[PDB]
Amino acid sequence: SFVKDFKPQALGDTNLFKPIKIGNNELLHRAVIPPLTRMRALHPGNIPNRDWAVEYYTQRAQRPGTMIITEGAFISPQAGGYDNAPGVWSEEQMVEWTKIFNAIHEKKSFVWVQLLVLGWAAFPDNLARDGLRYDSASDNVFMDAEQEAKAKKANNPQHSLTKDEIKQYIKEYVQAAKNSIAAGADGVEIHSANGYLLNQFLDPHSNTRTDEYGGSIENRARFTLEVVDALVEAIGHEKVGLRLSPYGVFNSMSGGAETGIVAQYAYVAGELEKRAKAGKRLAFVHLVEPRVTNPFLTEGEGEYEGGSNDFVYSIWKGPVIRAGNFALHPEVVREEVKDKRTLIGYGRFFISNPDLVDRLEKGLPLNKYDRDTFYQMSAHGYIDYPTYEEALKLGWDK
Ligand SMILES: Cc1cc2nc3c(=O)[nH]c(=O)nc-3n(C[C@H](O)[C@H](O)[C@H](O)COP(=O)(O)O)c2cc1C
Ligand SMILES: C=C(C)[C@@H]1CC=C(C)C(=O)C1
Ligand SMILES: [Cl-]
Ligand SMILES: [Mg+2]
Ligand SMILES: [Mg+2]
Ligand code: NA
Ligand code: NA
Numbered sequence: 001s002f003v004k005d006f007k008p009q010a011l012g013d014t015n016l017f018k019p020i021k022i023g024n025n026e027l028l029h030r031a032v033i034p035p036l037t038r039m040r041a042l043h044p045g046n047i048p049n050r051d052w053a054v055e056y057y058t059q060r061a062q063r064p065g066t067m068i069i070t071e072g073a074f075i076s077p078q079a080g081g082y083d084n085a086p087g088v089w090s091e092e093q094m095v096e097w098t099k100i101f102n103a104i105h106e107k108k109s110f111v112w113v114q115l116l117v118l119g120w121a122a123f124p125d126n127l128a129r130d131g132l133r134y135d136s137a138s139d140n141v142f143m144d145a146e147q148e149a150k151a152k153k154a155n156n157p158q159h160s161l162t163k164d165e166i167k168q169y170i171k172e173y174v175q176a177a178k179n180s181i182a183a184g185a186d187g188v189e190i191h192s193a194n195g196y197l198l199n200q201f202l203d204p205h206s207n208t209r210t211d212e213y214g215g216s217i218e219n220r221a222r223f224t225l226e227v228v229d230a231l232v233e234a235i236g237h238e239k240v241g242l243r244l245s246p247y248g249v250f251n252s253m254s255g256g257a258e259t260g261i262v263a264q265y266a267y268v269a270g271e272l273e274k275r276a277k278a279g280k281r282l283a284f285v286h287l288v289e290p291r292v293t294n295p296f297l298t299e300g301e302g303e304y305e306g307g308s309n310d311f312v313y314s315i316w317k318g319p320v321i322r323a324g325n326f327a328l329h330p331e332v333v334r335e336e337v338k339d340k341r342t343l344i345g346y347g348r349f350f351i352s353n354p355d356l357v358d359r360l361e362k363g364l365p366l367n368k369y370d371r372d373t374f375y376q377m378s379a380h381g382y383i384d385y386p387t388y389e390e391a392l393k394l395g396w397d398k
Contacts, residue, residue: 002365009330010363023283028065034345041086048096061109063357072116075176081122101184119197124151187239195251245288289324
């Protein structure tokens with residue numbers, strides 16, 4: 001069905017439909033597919049889904065010149081811990097990614113691989129089964145009681161990374177980025193948001209370290225910036241973006257309750273701008289809005305009103321992708337895109353609307369999404385959401 005009560009607005013007369021260059025890519029509009037974990041990768045080996053993933057991405061690439069950021073992809077076994085999320089470390093994985101990238105490119109769209117490292121969000125029992133550590137910044141603060149208990153039961157208690165282990169992750173980020181580019185991706189996005197490992201370092205709740213990787217703003221940002229620098233060196237700043245969620249509370253991050261949170265993220269933005277002014281500007285910064293502090297909650301819930309991401313624009317002078325509850329709020333998008341370096345990520349409604357871009361341009365009804373199949377091992381709720389035309393034929397206008 002279409003979303004009931006939604007009053008669409010045609011956005012074709014806004015900058016959402018003005019072209020913009022991101023990295024090497026000439027986007028034809030500024031509606032971005034943000035990274036969306038869908039859990040269709042197959043076990044063993046975290047293999048992108050051999051049956052459906054090409055079709056899923058092909059569908060969502062259908063509007064020419066669309067920027068697509070992939071679902072988070074694990075950079076190594078140790079970075080993982082969900083059996084049905086894909087990786088980008090193995091030949092068998094890259095065989096499938098190559099097909100996906102080729103398909104997106106045939107539709108004249110673009111694809112950026114999100115590089116994911118889970119830290120304390122991983123399942124410790126999966127990791128123990130595979131002989132892997134359960135990692136985070138610290139060893140004395142835990143995501144939640146259930147995770148702590150799972151880790152203990154698995155004889156895999158949460159481990160605070162050594163500097164050498166941080167370096168090993170950086171090596172893996174580098175190789176994952178290389179793999180991505182070699183397989184044909186247009187770039188990579190470093191996931192430093194939503195309470196995964198890099199965010200666990202950024203945030204003073206989760207990072208209680210007293211070495212150079214914690215205990216101050218500069219130190220908490222060090223790992224994220226080392227990954228940035230390593231990837232810029234390896235594949236070029238024009239092929240690297242960074243995702244941050246300053247106000248996020250998902251995965252037990254602090255959000256606005258931490259009075260130092262804006263300073264922490266301002267520091268990161270500043271360091272990116274410093275690199276940019278010195279000749280190495282990242283392709284983009286991707287921000288999750290305080291509009292959605294937890295993407296597991298229905299649109300409108302978990303909105304933080306005590307903060308704005310606008311501060312980033314005073315600091316970072318490059319492209320900014322913003323995501324969070326924009327599909328149902330064209331009136332907000334209309335205002336935000338008046339800024340000429342702002343792009344809009346649409347997550348949940350890109351799950352349910354493969355032709356979302358057409359619908360945004362033309363002010364069409366949106367397909368209701370089905371949360372229950374966000375993470376399912378099925379084509380259903382993955383590749384069988386209809387285009388607007390197909391929905392009319394199904395009688396959804398009624
Ligand atoms: C099912 C689902 C999977 C997601 N997977 C990822 C992910 O892999 N990486 C990431 O950075 N964000 C992920 N997100 C967060 C989204 O990219 C996006 O920021 C969020 O859904 C808010 O935007 P929306 O209101 O347009 O959905 C996910 C969100 C959902 C609902
Ligand atoms: C629905 C979410 C909370 C997403 C699930 C997986 C990843 C990698 C996120 O960044 C958040
Ligand atoms: Cl799992
Ligand atoms: Mg210990
Ligand atoms: Mg159902
Ligand atoms: Na449906
Ligand atoms: Na099938």
